[PDB]
């Protein structure tokens, strides 16, 4: 039986990978960092409250300038906001209200979004007419669109419930490559700081590192007990943090090919909806169905502090590129900026 | 106020945006959102025709009320990872064909389509997000059911059934078994209407069921149950 033999071979290969890993575990992060002074309590105040959405917020993104933010709500509107003055810059009606993900181009020229339509729409914010227009629609996914990230103005990467992730060429509307290997719906994407690699989290309680150019899965990370809902890349680009329904964040290392640390607490049973890191990566932030967001000492796994003030599930987090502020968005219809 | 001429202008523009957002909100606030759920060839399409790759939205107006219906079928993904989006839907419309009682799934010769419908019904009725959302249930293809029941007893799907092979009894029994799947009998309601391909009363039925759902919910918020 070719099939049985192949399955046995696969089991043997998995055994080799497991041992390769236990071979690198001389000590852990929680031991090497014992001589590192704790951050201490972190207290952050709300500085700005952004009002306007009349529905649950599903996604938010920060522009590279660190002053402009895009938010999406189920009332069919994207809003671009000047965070400093709370003024709205644009309000973009959508062709459908079922929006689950939104992104801001690094240049600031385009905004992408989508969800239960199974397509990704790209809007052009710089026009002669003066109004915002759809420049293109990307279709070819067969499941809902769970996440969109721009590499550059002509390239966007998407993840979908059809279990696949795809790199699209915006000029032609074509899918140029497809990533396969996940078996569950794919929940989230994060790009490496240099754009050369990206990580996809999925409902297989695993995550995969994918080479963008080579279209292949370099490494598979596992160990979560439930679906991974949020993923972030450590600022160096050599590590990543994943959140899941287990109420546990986990830090993985790309060079050891192994989990480095877990963040958990006995009183947290709510799932993790979002994860983010500070500029230095010393602080890890996570949003929970508890209506709160908890800062964590990323090197010690102690709780450093708590943000609170939402009346519903926190759906999204983001940290500006310059590290000056943290934004949180929620089902209560409000986005708050803390510092 | 310290603002420059351009900053003052920017604020005026922001205010106009808010004004327009409020007007769109007012219109949305007056619409009825219905969710259409059915299994396979349940006659869901027939219902859609009578009323008027991703989610499909149908808009119809009856007696000055605007209804938006979402067909969320054909999504081969995890319902759990997107079902919450419909938490605020006014009501759920579920379609089950009655003729399906003697049929099995192509994918599983031993799985009765009618039991598959009941499993689906149960998975949505008792869902956490739908604790207080009522269900409008359409038992369709009653004419094929009447033609078939005289040949095959319901015991082919319900071995426990012990009634006559008459349409009027078998159909009532099927209705009961769906109604019996409601754990929250004291919180949500199941409206049932037997239907067929030639039934012009389906719109009035949905309208009346929706009307009761809205009034009952407005009363709950006034402190009167």
């Amino acid at each position: 039986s070719e099939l049985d033999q192949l399955r046995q071979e696969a089991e043997q290969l998995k055994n080799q990978i497991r041992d390769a890993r236990k071979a690198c575990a001389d000590a852990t992060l929680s031991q090497i960092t014992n001589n590192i002074d704790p951050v201490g309590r972190i207290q952050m105040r709300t500085r700005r409250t952004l009002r306007g959405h009349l529905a649950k917020i599903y996604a938010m993104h920060w522009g590279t300038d660190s002053r402009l933010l895009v938010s999406a709500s189920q009332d069919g509107k994207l809003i671009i906001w000047d965070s400093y003055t709370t003024n709205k810059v644009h309000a973009i009606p959508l062709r459908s209200s079922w929006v689950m993900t939104c992104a801001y181009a690094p240049s600031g020229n385009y905004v992408a979004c989508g969800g239960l339509d199974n397509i990704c729409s790209i809007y052009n914010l710089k026009t002669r007419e003066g109004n915002v227009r759809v420049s293109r629609e990307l279709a070819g996914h067969t499941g809902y669109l769970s996440c969109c990230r721009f590499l550059d103005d002509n390239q966007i990467v998407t993840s979908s419930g059809d279990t696949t992730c795809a790199l699209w060429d915006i000029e032609t509307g074509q899918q140029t490559t497809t990533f396969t290997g996940h078996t569950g719906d794919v929940m989230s994407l994060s790009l490496a700081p240099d754009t050369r690699l990206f990580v996809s989290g999925a409902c297989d309680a695993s995550a995969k590192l994918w080479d963008v150019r080579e279209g292949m899965c370099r490494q598979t990370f596992t160990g979560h007990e439930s679906d991974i809902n949020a993923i972030c890349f450590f600022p160096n680009g050599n590590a990543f943090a994943t959140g899941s329904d287990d109420a546990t964040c986990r830090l993985f290392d790309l060079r050891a090919d192994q989990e480095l640390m877990t963040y958990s607490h006995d009183n947290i049973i709510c799932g993790i909806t979002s994860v983010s890191f500070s500029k230095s990566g010393r602080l890890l932030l996570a949003g929970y169905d508890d209506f709160n967001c908890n800062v964590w000492d990323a090197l010690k796994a102690d709780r450093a502090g708590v943000l609170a003030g939402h009346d519903n599930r926190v759906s999204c987090l983001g940290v500006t590129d310059d590290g000056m502020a943290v934004a949180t968005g929620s089902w209560d219809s409000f986005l708050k900026i803390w510092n | 106020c310290t603002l420059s001429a351009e900053d003052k202008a920017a604020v005026e523009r922001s205010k106009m945006i808010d004004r327009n957002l409020r007007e769109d909100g007012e219109k949305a606030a007056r619409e009825v959102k219905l969710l259409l759920l059915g299994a396979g060839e349940s006659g869901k399409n027939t219902i859609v025709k009578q009323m008027k790759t991703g989610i499909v939205e149908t808009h119809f107006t009856f007696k000055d009320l605007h209804f938006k219906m979402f067909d969320v079928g054909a999504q081969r993904s995890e319902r759990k990872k997107w079902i919450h989006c419909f938490e605020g839907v006014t009501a759920i419309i579920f379609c089950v064909a009655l003729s399906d009682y003697d049929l099995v799934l192509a994918e599983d010769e031993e799985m009765n389509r009618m039991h598959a419908s009941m499993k689906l019904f149960d998975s949505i009725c008792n869902n956490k997000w739908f604790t207080d959302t009522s269900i409008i249930l359409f038992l369709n293809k009653k004419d094929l059911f009447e033609e078939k029941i005289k040949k095959s007893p319901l015991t082919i799907c319900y071995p426990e059934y012990a009634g006559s092979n008459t349409y009027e009894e078998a159909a009532a029994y099927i209705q009961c078994q769906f109604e019996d799947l409601n754990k929250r009998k004291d919180t949500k309601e199941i409206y049932t209407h037997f239907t067929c391909s030639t039934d012009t009363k389906n719109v009035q039925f949905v309208f009346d069921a929706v009307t009761d759902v809205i009034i009952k919910n407005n009363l709950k918020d006034c402190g009167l149950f």
Partner: single-chain antibody
Framework: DVQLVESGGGLVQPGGSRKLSCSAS????????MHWVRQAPEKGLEWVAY????????YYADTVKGRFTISRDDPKNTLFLQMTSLRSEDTAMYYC??????????????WGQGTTLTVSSGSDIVMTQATSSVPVTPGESVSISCRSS???????????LYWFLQRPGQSPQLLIY???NLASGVPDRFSGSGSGTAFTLTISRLEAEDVGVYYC?????????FGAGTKLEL
């Protein structure tokens, strides 16, 4: 493409009245605030009036206040100037100018062609263009300066200075907005550098197209004001 076509000019006797009209095509008229700028035969641009998007705010120059009314009809995409009690000084070419304000916008980018109106028989910020003209030749570097009565810098950190180029027989065109930013469709050779009350526009690799009159504009407060203009020649 974007168009503004003014009409309603002609000859009027003093004390009489005319109504000017600016039809708008190719853009969302409702979202854009509109201005009227007049250039007399003296070739010095003067701001006349402003109507905001939605008609919420209207400002007029002191000279025309009470004799001129600005109105917009968004459904017909038209901008109107009602001129009454016309005086000889009112003779000029009137330009309809497009402007939108939000963070990162670039107002005054699009100018109409204008109409000609002929009429028979101290707190303002003042800007000076010390040089009335500069002879230039192709390939050379050119420095055009402007000075202001008060600093155009603001607490927000934005210096509100705009540079416009009017080629002969053509409407003025924005080159630089807010001191250092280049307008779309403007070659990289043009650059703007300034501090406080003193500003410089630097043109490199000069070309025949570049030759024309250059105007500095103040936009910190109303009235908006312009300098005299510097002419390049040769």
């Amino acid at each position: 493409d974007v168009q503004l076509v003014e009409s309603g000019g002609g000859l009027v006797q003093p004390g009489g009245s005319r109504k000017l009209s600016c039809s708008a095509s190719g853009f969302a008229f409702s979202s854009f605030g509109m201005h009227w700028v007049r250039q007399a035969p003296e070739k010095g641009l003067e701001w006349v009036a402003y109507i905001s998007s939605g008609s919420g705010t209207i400002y007029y120059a002191d000279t025309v206040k009470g004799r001129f009314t600005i109105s917009r009809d968004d459904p017909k995409n038209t901008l109107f100037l009602q001129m009454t009690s016309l005086r000889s000084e009112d003779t000029a070419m009137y330009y309809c100018v497009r402007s939108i304000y939000y963070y990162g916008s670039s107002p005054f980018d699009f100018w109409g062609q204008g109409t000609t109106l002929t009429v028979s028989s101290g707190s303002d910020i003042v800007m000076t263009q010390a040089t009335s003209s500069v002879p230039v030749t192709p390939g050379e570097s050119v420095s055009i300066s402007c000075r202001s009565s008060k600093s155009l810098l603001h607490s927000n950190g934005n210096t509100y200075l705009y540079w416009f180029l009017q080629r002969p027989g053509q409407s003025p065109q924005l080159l630089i907005y807010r001191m250092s930013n280049l307008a779309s469709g403007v070659p990289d050779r043009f650059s703007g550098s300034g501090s406080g009350t003193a500003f410089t526009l630097t043109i490199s690799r000069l070309e025949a197209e570049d030759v024309g009159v250059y105007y500095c504009m103040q936009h910190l407060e109303y009235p908006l004001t312009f300098g005299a203009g510097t002419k390049l020649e040769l």
